[PDB]
Amino acid sequence: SVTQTMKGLDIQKVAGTWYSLAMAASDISLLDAQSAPARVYVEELKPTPEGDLEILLQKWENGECAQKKIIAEKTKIPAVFKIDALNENKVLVLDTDYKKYLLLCFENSAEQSLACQCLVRTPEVDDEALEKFDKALKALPMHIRLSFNPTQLEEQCHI
C-alpha cells in the first residue's frame, strides 16, 4: 500500500507530453499480455483549471492500439486523485521534477491491484529516474516490472 507521496505538488506543472518508460504491478496478470488490464501507455497529462487531472493514454484492446481519455478528480490531498468507476481508484503522485520524470501509481480496493509507472519527458532511458522508481517500489508488493527501449517508446502501444 502506497505511503509515498510528493509533498508540495504543483499539478499544473505536470502538464504535457509523457512517456511510460517502465511499469510495475502487484500481480503478473496485470501486465503480462499485450492487452493486460494495467498495460496502459501515457501520452499526455492535462490538468484542468479546477485542478482535476485528465489522462490521455493508449491501450491495446481486441487486436489494436486504441486511444482513451480518463479523468481523475482532485481530492483534499494535492498528490491524490480519484477515478470513480466500478471501484474507488486512486492515482497517487509519488515524486516528480516536472521537467524530466514523474512517478505515479494507480490502486484500487479489493486483494488490492496496484500498478506504478516511471514517466519521462523524452524517448530516452533515464537511469536516475529508474533508480528513483526502483527505490519507491522496494516498499510495495510488486511481482512484475517491464521497461521500454527508445524505439518502442516512439511506437503506438510501444510495439
Residues of this chain that bind its own copies (CB under 8 A): 28, 32-34, 143-149
Ramachandran angles phi, psi of 151, nearest 5°: -65, -55
> How many CA atoms lie within 13 Å of 98's alpha carbon, on the beta-carbon side?
7
How many residues belong to the site for ligand Z80 (CB under 6 A)?
Answer: 15
96 closest CA partner among 2, 1, 10:
10
Q: Which of ligand Z80, its own copies, none does residue 116 bind (CB under 5 to 8 Å by kind)? A: none
Q: Does 70 participate in binding ligand Z80 (rule CB under 6 A)?
A: yes
Please give the single-letter amino acid code of residue 158: H
Contact, 11 vs 77, CB < 8 A?
A: no
Contact, 16 vs 44, CB < 8 A?
A: yes
x/- mask, ligand Z80, residues 111-130, rule CB under 6 A, reads: --x-x---------------
Given the complex with its own copies, which of 24 and 79 has the nearer CB atom? Answer: 24
Site residues (CB under 6 A) for ligand Z80? 37-38, 40, 55, 57, 59, 68, 70, 83, 89, 106-108, 113, 115
